[PDB]
C-alpha cells in the first residue's frame, strides 16, 4: 500500500534541490515519482523545503480548500516550489511536462494523529 503522508511526500516533496533549475526537472521528475505510471498525471507541484518545514505548514493558516473542505493551510512564508505541467506534445507514456520554478505560499490540506499533509490544494 501506501500512506496518504507516504504518498504527499512521494508526490510533492523535494528538499534535495533548491530551485528547478534544469528544463529537464519536471519530465524527470514525474517518472520518478511514478505520476506518469498509468496516465500522465496533468500539474504536479514539488516543493524544495524541509519535510519539518512542510509539515510545519499544517500548524499555520487555516484556509477553506478548493473542494469546500476545512483542513487546509496556508504558510506563513513563500515557499520554493516547481510546478509541472503536461504539455501538448506529451502523449503516455511519454509524458511531457514544462518545469515552472516560483517562491510561493503553499496550500496543503493536513490529516491524522500526528496532523500531517496529505494533498496539496494551491499556491498562491
Ligand atoms: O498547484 C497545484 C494544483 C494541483 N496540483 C495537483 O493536481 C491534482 C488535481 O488538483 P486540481 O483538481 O486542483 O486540478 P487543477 O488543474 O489544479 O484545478 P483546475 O484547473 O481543474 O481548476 P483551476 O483552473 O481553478 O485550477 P488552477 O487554475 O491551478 O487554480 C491535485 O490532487 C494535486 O496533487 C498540484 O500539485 N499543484
Ligand atoms: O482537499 C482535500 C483533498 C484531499 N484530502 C485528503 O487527502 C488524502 C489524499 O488525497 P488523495 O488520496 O486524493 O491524493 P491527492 O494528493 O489528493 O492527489 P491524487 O490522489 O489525485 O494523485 P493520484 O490519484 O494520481 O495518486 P497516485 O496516482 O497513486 O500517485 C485523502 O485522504 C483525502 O481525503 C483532504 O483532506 N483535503
Known sequence: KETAAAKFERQHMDSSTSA?????YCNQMMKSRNLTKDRCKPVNT???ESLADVQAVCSQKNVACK???TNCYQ??????????????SSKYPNCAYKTTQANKHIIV??????????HFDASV
Open 20 to 24: 528547478a533549475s534544469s528544463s529537464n
Open 46 to 48: 514539488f516543493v524544495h
Open 67 to 69: 473542494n469546500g473542505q
Open 75 to 88: 504558510s506563513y512564508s513563500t515557499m520554493s516550489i516547481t510546478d509541472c505541467r503536461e504539455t501538448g
Open 109 to 118: 490540506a493536513c490529516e491524522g494523529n500526528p496532523y500531517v499533509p496529505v
